[PDB]
C-alpha cells in the first residue's frame, strides 16, 4: 500500500568537450515516468509512461525548465566542489542527486529524502526529519553550515512534505491502472548438475511488479545460506522484474530442500519444490 | 512535479 515519487539526477563533467552530460529520471514506485538527457535532441522533459502523457503544455514546459535549472546548478557545484577538494580542472567528475517522498496506504506523507554525492560517495544529505543535515566529510561540512544559515532545508521540506506528495497522489489516480496493479511472480525450478553427484537447484521468479520479492532456500524446517547464491533483481524491459536463488545439493535428497517465494500480489505465499 | 528550488553546494 506504500507508494513513492523519486527523482534521480546525474551530471558528469566533460573537461574540454563542451558542457557536462546531464541525465535526469523520474519514478513513481518502480515505474519510470519521465526522463531528461542533455545529449538528446528535444532538450525537453520526456514521458516514459502513458498516464503522464495526459498532462498539458504548462506541466511539460514547466518540468523542462526546472530540470534544465537542475543542471545549471549542478554545473556550478561541479566547479565549487573542485575548489572544495582542491582538484585539477583537467579531471572529470560526477555529481549525483536524488530526492523524493513516500506515502502510505492512506496516501498521506510518510517520509522525505534529499541526498547528494560527489564522485559516487556521500557528500551531504537531508536527515530523517527534513530539518538538519548529515555531512560525510570535511568539504560537505562547509556546505552544511552554509545551508543551515541559508535556510535550505526549510524550502526543500515544503516540497518534500507538500508539493511532492500532492502530485504523487495526482499521479497515482491519473495512472490508476498502471501504478496500482499487482503482478505476481511466475515461478518454476531448474536442475543443473555440475559435479557429478551434487547438483545446483534454481528457483525462478519472473514477470512480477513491483520489484520487491524474497527468495529463500531451506533446512526443510526453515532456511539455508551455505550457498544460496542470489542475483540482483533485474528488469525485463516490459515493466516487470526477475530474480533467482540457487542451492547446490547432494544428489538424492533434492526432495527435502524447498524454495519460498514471498511477494505482494500473491494472496498466500508460495512454497515451491522439485518432486 | 520536480523541485522548484534547489541549493548550491
Amino acid at each position, epitope marked *: 500500500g506504500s507508494h513513492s515519487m523519486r527523482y534521480f539526477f546525474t551530471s558528469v563533467s566533460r573537461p574540454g568537450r563542451g558542457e557536462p552530460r546531464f541525465i535526469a529520471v523520474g519514478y513513481v514506485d518502480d515505474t519510470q515516468f519521465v526522463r531528461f538527457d542533455s545529449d538528446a535532441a528535444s532538450q525537453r522533459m520526456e514521458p516514459r509512461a502513458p498516464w503522464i502523457e495526459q498532462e498539458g503544455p504548462e506541466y511539460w514546459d514547466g518540468e523542462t525548465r*526546472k530540470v534544465k*535549472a537542475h543542471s*545549471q*546548478t549542478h*554545473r*556550478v557545484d561541479l*566547479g*565549487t566542489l573542485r575548489g572544495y577538494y582542491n582538484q585539477s580542472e583537467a579531471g572529470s567528475h560526477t555529481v549525483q542527486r536524488m530526492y523524493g517522498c513516500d506515502v502510505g496506504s492512506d496516501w498521506r506523507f510518510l517520509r522525505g529524502y534529499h541526498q547528494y554525492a560527489y564522485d559516487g560517495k556521500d557528500y551531504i544529505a537531508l536527515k530523517e526529519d527534513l530539518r538538519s543535515w548529515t555531512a560525510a566529510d570535511m568539504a560537505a561540512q*562547509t*556546505t552544511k553550515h*552554509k*545551508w543551515e*544559515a*541559508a*535556510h*535550505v532545508a*526549510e*524550502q526543500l521540506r*515544503a516540497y518534500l512534505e507538500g508539493t511532492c506528495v500532492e502530485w504523487l497522489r495526482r499521479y497515482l489516480e491519473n495512472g490508476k491502472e498502471t501504478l496500482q496493479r499487482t503482478d505476481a511472480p511466475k515461478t518454476h525450478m531448474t536442475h543443473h548438475a555440475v559435479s557429478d553427484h551434487e547438483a545446483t537447484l534454481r528457483c525462478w521468479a519472473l514477470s512480477f511488479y513491483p520489484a520487491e520479492i524474497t527468495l529463500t532456500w531451506q533446512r526443510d524446517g526453515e532456511d539455508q545460506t551455505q550457498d544460496t547464491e542470489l542475483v540482483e533483481t533485474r528488469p525485463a524491459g516490459d515493466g516487470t522484474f526477475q530474480k533467482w536463488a540457487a542451492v547446490v545439493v547432494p544428489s538424492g535428497q533434492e526432495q527435502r530442500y524447498t524454495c519460498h517465494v514471498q511477494h505482494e500480489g500473491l494472496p498466500k505465499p508460495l512454497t515451491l519444490r522439485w518432486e | 512535479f520536480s523541485g*522548484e*528550488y*534547489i*541549493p*548550491t*553546494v
Partner: T-cell receptor
Amino acid sequence: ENVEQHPSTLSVQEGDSAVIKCTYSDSASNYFPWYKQELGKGPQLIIDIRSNVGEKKDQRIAVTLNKTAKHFSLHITETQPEDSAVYFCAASRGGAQKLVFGQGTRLTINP
Amino acid sequence: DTAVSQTPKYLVTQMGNDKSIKCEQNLGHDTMYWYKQDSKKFLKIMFSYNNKELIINETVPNRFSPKSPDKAHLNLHINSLELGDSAVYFCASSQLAGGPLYNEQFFGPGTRLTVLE
C-alpha cells in the same frame, strides 16, 4: 518572465511612510531583493527575502512577501533626506538563475 | 579597499564602430555579470560567468561578445555599434555557493556609452 514596479515616481515628506509595491509573474520565484541606486551609480542591495518569512525588517526598511498572490513590497518607514534614490525590486528563482527587475521607482523625500 | 571596478567611465563614438569594455573584482567571487540599463532605467541581465563557464545568455545579437579569462576579470567587446546601445553597462559579481548563502550582487560604477550618427 515579468515584474511590475508601482509607482514610477513617489514623493514623501521627511516624516511620512513610503511604500513601493511590486508584482512578479512567475510563482516559482523564491528570492526577492530590493536594490538601491543612488545616482546613476552601481545598484546596491539594501534588503532581500528568501525562507518564506512574510516579513524581513532591518531598522528603517522592511519587506513583505505574500507569495500566493504574487506580490512583495518595500516599506520605508522613518523617511529621511538621504533615503532619496531610485529603488528597484527584483525577483529570481534563486541559485544560478536570472534576476528580473521592475521598472524601478524614483523616490523623493521632500525635506 | 575592495570592489567591482569597470573601465572606461564614459565613452562616446558613432555608428558601426568598435569599442570594448572591461571589468574586474577582487572580492573573490564565483560569478560575474553584465547588465544593460537602457534610456529609461530598466536593468536587463545579458550574460554571466561562473568560473570561466558561461551560464546566462539571454539573446545574443552576436555583435555582443563577452569574454571571461579568469574568475576575477570580465570583459565585453561590442562590434558594429547601434544608436540603441546608448545604454549604461553594468558589471556585477555575486557568490553562488552555500545556497547561495550570500545572495547579493555587487555592482560596478557602470560604463556609460552614448553612440551617435
